[PDB]
Amino acid sequence: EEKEILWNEAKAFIAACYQELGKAAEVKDRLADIKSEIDLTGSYVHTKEELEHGAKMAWRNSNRCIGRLFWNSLNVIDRRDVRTKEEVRDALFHHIETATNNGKIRPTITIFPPEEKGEKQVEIWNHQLIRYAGYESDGERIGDPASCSLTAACEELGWRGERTDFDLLPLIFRMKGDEQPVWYELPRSLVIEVPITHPDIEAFSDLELKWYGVPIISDMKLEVGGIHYNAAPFNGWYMGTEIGARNLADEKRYDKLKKVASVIGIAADYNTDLWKDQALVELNKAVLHSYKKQGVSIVDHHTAASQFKRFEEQAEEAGRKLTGDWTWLIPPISPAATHIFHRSYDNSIVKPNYFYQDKPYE
Amino acid sequence: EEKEILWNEAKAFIAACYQELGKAAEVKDRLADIKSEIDLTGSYVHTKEELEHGAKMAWRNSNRCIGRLFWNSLNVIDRRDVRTKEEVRDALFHHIETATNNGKIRPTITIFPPEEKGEKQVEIWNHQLIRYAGYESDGERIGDPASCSLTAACEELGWRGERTDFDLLPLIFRMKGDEQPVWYELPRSLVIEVPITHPDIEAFSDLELKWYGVPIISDMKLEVGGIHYNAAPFNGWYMGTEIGARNLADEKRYDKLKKVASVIGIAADYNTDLWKDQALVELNKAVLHSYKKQGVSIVDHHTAASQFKRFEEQAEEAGRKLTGDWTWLIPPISPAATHIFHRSYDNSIVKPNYFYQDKPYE
Numbered sequence: 220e221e222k223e224i225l226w227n228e229a230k231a232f233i234a235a236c237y238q239e240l241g242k243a244a245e246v247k248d249r250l251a252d253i254k255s256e257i258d259l260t261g262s263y264v265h266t267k268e269e270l271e272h273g274a275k276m277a278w279r280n281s282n283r284c285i286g287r288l289f290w291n292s293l294n295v296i297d298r299r300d301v302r303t304k305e306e307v308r309d310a311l312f313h314h315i316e317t318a319t320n321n322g323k324i325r326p327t328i329t330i331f332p333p334e335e336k337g338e339k340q341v342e343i344w345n346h347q348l349i350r351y352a353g354y355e356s357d358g359e360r361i362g363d364p365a366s367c368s369l370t371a372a373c374e375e376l377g378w379r380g381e382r383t384d385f386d387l388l389p390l391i392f393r394m395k396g397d398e399q400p401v402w403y404e405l406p407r408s409l410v411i412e413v414p415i416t417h418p419d420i421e422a423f424s425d426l427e428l429k430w431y432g433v434p435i436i437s438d439m440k441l442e443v444g445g446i447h448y449n450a451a452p453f454n455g456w457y458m459g460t461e462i463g464a465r466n467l468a469d470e471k472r473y474d475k476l477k478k479v480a481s482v483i484g485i486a487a488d489y490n491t492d493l494w495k496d497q498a499l500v501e502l503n504k505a506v507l508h509s510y511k512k513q514g515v516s517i518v519d520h521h522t523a524a525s526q527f528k529r530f531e532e533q534a535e536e537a538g539r540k541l542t543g544d545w546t547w548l549i550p551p552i553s554p555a556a557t558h559i560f561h562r563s564y565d566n567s568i569v570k571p572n573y574f575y576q577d578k579p580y581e
Numbered sequence: 582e583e584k585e586i587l588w589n590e591a592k593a594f595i596a597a598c599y600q601e602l603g604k605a606a607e608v609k610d611r612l613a614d615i616k617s618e619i620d621l622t623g624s625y626v627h628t629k630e631e632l633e634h635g636a637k638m639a640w641r642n643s644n645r646c647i648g649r650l651f652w653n654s655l656n657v658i659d660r661r662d663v664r665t666k667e668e669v670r671d672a673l674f675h676h677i678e679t680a681t682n683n684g685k686i687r688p689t690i691t692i693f694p695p696e697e698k699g700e701k702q703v704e705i706w707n708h709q710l711i712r713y714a715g716y717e718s719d720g721e722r723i724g725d726p727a728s729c730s731l732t733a734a735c736e737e738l739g740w741r742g743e744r745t746d747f748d749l750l751p752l753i754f755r756m757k758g759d760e761q762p763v764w765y766e767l768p769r770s771l772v773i774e775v776p777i778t779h780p781d782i783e784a785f786s787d788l789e790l791k792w793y794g795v796p797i798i799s800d801m802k803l804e805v806g807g808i809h810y811n812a813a814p815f816n817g818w819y820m821g822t823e824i825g826a827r828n829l830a831d832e833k834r835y836d837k838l839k840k841v842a843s844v845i846g847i848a849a850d851y852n853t854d855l856w857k858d859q860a861l862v863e864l865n866k867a868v869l870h871s872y873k874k875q876g877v878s879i880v881d882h883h884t885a886a887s888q889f890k891r892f893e894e895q896a897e898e899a900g901r902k903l904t905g906d907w908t909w910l911i912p913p914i915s916p917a918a919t920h921i922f923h924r925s926y927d928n929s930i931v932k933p934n935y936f937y938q939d940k941p942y943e
């Protein structure tokens with residue numbers, strides 16, 4: 220059934236992909252070659268055109284993503300040729316550099332060799348390529364609590380964090396055949412960070428907040444035509460609310476709202492004063508202002524939602540069904556001020572797509 | 582099958598209701614009487630205890646409602662005895678007066694005779710007992726656009742609005758047997774309104790905003806044990822966001838955000854300034870402040886969510902499954918700052934409950 224699962228997905232993908240590429244006539248012949256290769260090898264190999272378009276379709280099908288308007292301009296890097304951990308590291312270093320692009324972020328995905336017998340060739344441990352470490356012991360919380368388990372795993376492997384609130388985690392990944400992953404410190408010259416200041420409130424810098432420039436998801440599986448690319452890190456630029464309303468604001472993350480309240484000079488004593496809402500707004504203004512000032516790409520949730528409306532319109536104009544997860548698409552701030560809040564979305568899974576997979580640690 | 586639908590719902594309801602009331606032993610006998618009455622009369626009649634508890638269960642089961650902690654203190658008024666339009670009017674007038682309670686709002690439901698053969702005895706046309714009229718003609722929008730169709734229906738029937746932005750709609754309802762509904766102007770001495778001022782910003786009063794004190798939903802059907810109470814208006818007190826983030830803020834309602842932006846002295850030119858978010862917050866602070874100052878009950882979304890958490894805890898402690906609609910339970914402002922945002926809810930329909938029904942007009 221597994222090989223049958225493969226061939227069925229291949230048939231569906233090649234048909235769709237080639238139709239979109241105006242290569243419909245070449246489907247019959249290509250499917251034959253694939254059919255044979257599966258019979259002989261137990262799998263098949265994507266052409267570079269299929270791989271690139273597959274990765275683009277996969278972004279297009281990501282129900283939780285508000286930024287899908289730009290699916291067709293995804294920059295795809297084909298690293299199916301890597302065999303060594305040095306090559307994997309260098310490819311990850313390169314992805315960070317080219318995606319960052321001096322602040323003018325390029326949505327990029329780097330694609331590593333796919334699973335074979337469900338057997339990974341490269342197993343990435345990071346959730347994102349750039350993220351801050353987290354610590355908890357003896358009442359003291361330091362850094363990003365969402366990073367606590369990975370951080371402790373890294374520190375098993377001989378890495379030691381400086382225990383600032385913003386330690387950059389090393390890259391950590393395991394090669395097929397090795398029992399233990401390896402880790403490499405990120406070159407700081409590769410990592411753009413943005414200090415959070417406020418356009419009007421000078422004391423905001425007293426909070427000494429910052430965030431990294433580029434979110435590069437490295438823990439999802441890209442599935443294209445029955446082929447499982449478990450190692451395929453991808454990035455966009457941030458929507459401000461991800462940083463201001465969640466990473467910095469959540470009680471189980473950096474939990475900064477009371478401190479924000481204090482520096483903007485409002486009491487944090489009464490629910491009816493809406494101090495949390497006010498703090499959220501100013502913190503989010505600060506995030507957008509700070510990124511813009513440093514020349515690092517970012518989008519506000521209003522512009523993003525307007526782009527998403529265009530994505531919806533394009534979909535219908537092209538005759539593609541639109542799928543979406545309403546619960547993730549709405550921004551965590553002023554959701555009812557976007558059109559997304561006022562309609563519904565079909566949450567069906569369409570492939571190609573990006574999927575969660577089990578962590579290799581804890 | 583219809584009578585069978587009735588008996589099945591009756592069996593389920595009486596069992597559950599009596600179990601909760603510690604009247605389990607009396608189920609067998611009561612179900613017999615009901616079984617007979619259905620055979621003979623084509624329906625059955627609730628005892629006052631069943632009716633009251635049914636209405637309370639129905640609130641408890643309302644998946645979209647954040648304010649369910651107080652389900653068991655619902656004030657139930659039994660008006661199954663009304664036969665005339667004067668009695669219906671007087672009962673509606675009374676509901677407004679006793680629910681308002683000089684600003685100290687009492688969650689109340691008044692229950693009118695139920696449908697018979699699916700035939701209504703009393704057909705209420707209002708969406709809420711107190712609501713503002715809406716007009717649209719020749720480019721000019723006046724009042725609440727959500728009221729446009731009902732307003733035009735009222736004006737067919739000989740009513741004429743003053744065409745301020747806050748005309749109180751008359752009560753409008755039809756009696757079984759009459760071809761046309763009747764309407765009655767609301768006595769203004771019965772209707773508490775709150776002028777919207779801001780605690781810090783004196784110019785906010787220049788907007789000349791107000792809202793009514795008590796939301797009294799009059800267009801839903803209460804269903805209890807297979808009995809359809811189509812006319813059963815109910816009220817709570819407002820959560821501020823309903824007024825500040827929707828009624829006054831929505832583009833398709835009062836659309837006040839630009840005016841709010843101007844009076845609080847911020848530009849409304851750039852998405853990245855988050856002026857809509859800031860305007861939303863100040864408008865919502867104003868709403869809470871204004872209601873509190875006038876001694877009219879209201880709750881902020883933070884306190885409401887804290888109460889809902891207690892509702893969740895009570896449910897589990899009492900062994901009842903909890904049902905909820907995540908998409909309605911999250912507040913439209915700072916949703917991720919409430920616990921609701923961070924969990925999921927089962928959206929199953931449990932009866933008794935309140936249901937939408939078709940409008941009698943347009």
Ligand code: HEM
Pocket residue numbers: 274277278281283284285286287289293326327328453454455456457458461518523547573
């Ligand atoms: C170009 C800028 C982009 C923006 C502004 C953007 C925005 C977002 C946002 C706000 C989320 C919600 C995540 C959260 O709530 O934590 C999201 C989720 C997601 N985005 Fe995008 N995105 C972008 C590019 C991309 C790219 C390039 C891909 C992949 C090729 C992608 C795939 C996804 C996926 C798979 C999710 C769901 C992740 C999960 O379930 O954990 N997005 N996006």
Ligand code: HEM
Pocket residue numbers: 636639640643645646647648649651655688689690815816817818819820823880885909935
């Ligand atoms: C005591 C104060 C109450 C508060 C603060 C409250 C709060 C809310 C809120 C915020 C909503 C969402 C409505 C919207 O988004 O427009 C809602 C919906 C609802 N509430 Fe409550 N509520 C209260 C009392 C009641 C009572 C007394 C009942 C009935 C006995 C009730 C039944 C419902 C129902 C049925 C809905 C959904 C209405 C619909 O689908 O249109 N609530 N409530």
Ligand SMILES: Cc1cc(N)nc(CCCCCO[C@H]2CNC[C@H]2Cc2cc(C)cc(N)n2)c1
Pocket residue numbers: 346434435436438439453454455456457458461575
């Ligand atoms: C590509 C991209 C662009 C952009 N602007 N923003 C993003 C954000 C990606 C969000 C992924 C992080 O999600 C975490 C934090 N909220 C829920 C949780 C979801 C999750 C769980 C697991 C097990 C893995 C995973 N990758 N993601 C990604």
Ligand SMILES: Cc1cc(N)nc(CCCCCO[C@H]2CNC[C@H]2Cc2cc(C)cc(N)n2)c1
Pocket residue numbers: 708796797798800801815816817818819820823937
């Ligand atoms: C009892 C109560 C207390 C409280 N604090 N708030 C409420 C608000 C009730 C909301 C009902 C109004 O809902 C309208 C506006 N948003 C969606 C729409 C839903 C709707 C549609 C229809 C056809 C009928 C109806 N009653 N409700 C009710």
Ligand SMILES: C[C@H](O)[C@H](O)[C@H]1CNc2nc(N)[nH]c(=O)c2N1
Pocket residue numbers: 559560561562563908909910911
């Ligand atoms: C139908 C569509 O999901 C719509 O935007 C919903 C979303 N959640 C909501 N939540 C509440 N409380 N009230 C509403 O009117 C709506 N509207």
Ligand SMILES: C[C@H](O)[C@H](O)[C@H]1CNc2nc(N)[nH]c(=O)c2N1
Pocket residue numbers: 546547548549921922923924925
């Ligand atoms: C799982 C639960 O619904 C949770 O609160 C969701 C809600 N919507 C979300 N939406 C976004 N964009 N990101 C998230 O992490 C979540 N979390």
Ligand SMILES: [Cl-]
Pocket residue numbers: 434461466
């Ligand atoms: Cl992030």
Ligand SMILES: [Cl-]
Pocket residue numbers: 796823828
């Ligand atoms: Cl309302």
